[PDB]
């Protein structure tokens, strides 16, 4: 069947996607990167604070319709200004 996920970045963008509940999220993630001009290495996909694997499936993660996937940038730190 078909479900609709929303990918929300830290910049307030939201990208709609349609995938079958049994499709591994890899293609969605890769597509997101391409459209947003991002690099996989530098970002982080999270569903309710938990990391998502390309092999994960909307079903295995128990995602409902109109659920949101959060995208984060990497964080680095050594000293404050």
């Amino acid at each position: 069947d078909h479900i609709n996920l929303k990918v929300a970045g830290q910049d307030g963008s939201v990208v709609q996607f349609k995938i079958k509940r049994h499709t591994p999220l890899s293609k969605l993630m890769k597509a997101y990167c391409e459209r947003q001009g991002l690099s996989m290495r530098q970002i982080r996909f999270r569903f309710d604070g938990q990391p998502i694997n390309e092999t994960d499936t909307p079903a295995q993660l128990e995602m409902e319709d109109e659920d949101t996937i959060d995208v984060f940038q990497q964080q680095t730190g050594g000293v404050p200004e």
């Binding site: 290495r41 982080r44 999270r46 000293v79």
Partner: protein
Amino acid sequence: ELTEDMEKEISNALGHGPQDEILSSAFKLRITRGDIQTLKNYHWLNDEVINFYMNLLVERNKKQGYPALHVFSTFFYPKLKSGGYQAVKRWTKGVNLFEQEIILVPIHRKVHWSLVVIDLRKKCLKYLDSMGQKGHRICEILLQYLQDESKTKRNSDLNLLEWTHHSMKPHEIPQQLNGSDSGMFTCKYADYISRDKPITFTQHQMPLFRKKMVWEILHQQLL
């Protein structure tokens, strides 16, 4: 204490090779050679290394009988400070915070790492920073978060009069003497506090700690 083979293994992980090579997998995280290299001397640790180590502390505590620990993601705080309880409400699916004893909140400041400790057993917050920065307001936000978690997940408001939050005195907790070990201090603070141990380390140990952390991550075993 660090075998010649442990060193040979650490040296191999920090050495030359592709960025993307995966060297350790657990907790749905994949630590690549590029992540592991942020553990080189003078390098700034990234979120992957910290979240991973934090997850190891939780496991270590369960195994060695230390207090029930719960660690939030390095992404929790920023998400909270920007979208409030609603943005991070579901980040606690099927886990009751209050059944825990020590809660750790890693805090990422634009280019600096920090730590907040919530001790449910004493109902008190504590902000820890290796460069003496202030965090009274960070704890307030976190405390308000607990309140909302309590009323929203177990219909009952906290009695804020019982909670107290004191910021650590730069003369009590060790401070960093250089420009790159804040991430390391954050992890070692969390480590000692997870074991109810007095923070007695100094900037002098950081180099060995860095070496040991790469071994600990590859082997998913603390030393």
